[PDB]
């Protein structure tokens, strides 16, 4: 039941306990490096529902990302930038998925769940051997994480006509002149 | 209407017969794999949504759970004996339910099932 | 282009690739279908000769006069 208790406690963020804990951690993470390793998820329920296991092969990295804009607005989020930086640091791991942890007023903070594809436990266990497959190299760079799908607009409906099934692919398909043999 | 670069985006279908032969050979290869079996799964009969097309029936995606039960075909065995199952479609009409159960009974009568190994 | 030109200029042999296909185009084995399958006949022709249905779907065109395999 601890997972629902944590889910509700995370839903209530400006509550006194969560605000106090977030302040102290925000201080601790500013004292720590821009990108550093975590040990244990500070949000175990979020990590678990995103797919973190306590197996030899799963690791957490906390990354600090500067907030704001370029009046130009960057089409990729600060979440995607954090994932890409964590991947460039740990080039030997696959970025499974990232989640928010702190925000302060100058930097947002994100814990990224990463999986080692070369570990024997990961390779033998299904449900993760897909990320052992080679088509999933640098999902964070190709926009294949949750932030990437959200930014690409990969949803079904009449509100996502131009972006679902690939925006550039749709534009090309609409801008090709098809000529047949019998016209 | 040539303000864009249609020259760099133009497609010619000179491979129409080649693709046709490829498709026919693909249907031959799945028939070689699924030898006694047909190369397609059974599809239900459904009514077209729009009032423009509502007087004509067509082939749907898969058979519904309650019509499958009414015809007497188990859910876990229907995709095995070659019947498509659609858990999203709902009957809402005795007419469609009866027509689809008639279709499944015709399949039952015309089917040959081999006894496992 | 440069790679092909170098190949044509060099004495290293050309690697002729056997016409391998991922999927077999004819039934094989020691069962009734394999022993009664005619490799020179088409799918519909073979299923008409067998007495079996090759497609439970709607016909997408006109069949041969003696076709009985496209229900």
């Amino acid at each position: 039941g601890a997972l629902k208790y944590l889910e509700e406690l995370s839903k209530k963020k400006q509550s006194d306990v969560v605000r106090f804990l977030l302040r102290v951690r925000c201080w601790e993470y500013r004292q720590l490096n821009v990108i550093h390793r975590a040990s244990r998820p500070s949000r175990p329920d979020k990590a678990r529902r995103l797919g973190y296991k306590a197996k030899q092969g799963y690791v957490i990295y906390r990354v600090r990302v500067r907030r704001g804009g370029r009046q130009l607005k960057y089409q990729r989020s600060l979440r995607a930038t954090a994932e890409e930086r964590v991947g460039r640091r740990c080039s030997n791991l696959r970025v499974l998925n990232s989640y928010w942890v702190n925000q302060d007023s100058t930097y947002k903070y994100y814990e990224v769940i990463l999986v080692d594809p070369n570990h024997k436990a990961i390779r033998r266990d299904p449900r993760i051997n897909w990320i052992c497959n080679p088509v999933h190299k640098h999902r964070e760079c190709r926009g294949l994480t949750s932030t990437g799908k959200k930014s690409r607009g990969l949803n079904k409906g009449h509100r996502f006509n131009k972006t679902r099934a690939g925006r550039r692919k749709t534009w090309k398909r609409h801008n090709t002149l098809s000529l047949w043999r019998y016209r | 209407h040539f303000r864009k670069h249609w020259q760099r985006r133009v497609r010619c279908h000179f491979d129409q017969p080649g693709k046709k032969v490829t498709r026919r050979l693909a249907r031959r290869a799945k028939a070689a794999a699924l030898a006694p079996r047909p190369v397609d799964k059974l599809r239900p009969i459904v009514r077209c949504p729009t009032v423009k097309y509502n007087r004509r029936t067509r082939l749907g995606r898969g058979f519904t759970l309650e019509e499958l039960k009414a015809a007497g075909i188990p859910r876990l065995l229907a995709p095995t004996i070659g019947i498509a199952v659609d858990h999203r479609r709902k009957n809402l009409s005795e007419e469609s339910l009866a027509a689809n159960v008639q279709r499944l009974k015709d399949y039952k009568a015309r089917l040959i099932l081999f006894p496992r190994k | 282009r440069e790679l092909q030109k170098r190949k044509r200029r060099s004495s290293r042999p050309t690697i002729r690739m056997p016409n391998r296909r991922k999927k077999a185009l004819n039934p094989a084995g020691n069962n009734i279908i394999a022993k009664s399958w005619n490799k020179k006949e088409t799918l519909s022709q073979n299923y008409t000769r067998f007495g079996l249905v090759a497609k439970l779907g709607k016909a997408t065109g006109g069949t041969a006069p003696g076709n009985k395999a496209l229900l």
């Binding site: 299904p126 449900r127 | 006694p36 079996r37 004996i81 089917l111 040959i112 496992r116 | 008409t48 249905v53």
Partner: peptide
């Protein structure tokens, strides 16, 4: 393969069938 998938394939494997003309 996962144990649940193995059980499903064991107890409901793709059967051989023919449909008459």
């Amino acid at each position: 393969v996962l144990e649940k998938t193995k059980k499903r394939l064991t107890h409901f494997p793709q059967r051989k069938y023919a449909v008459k003309a």
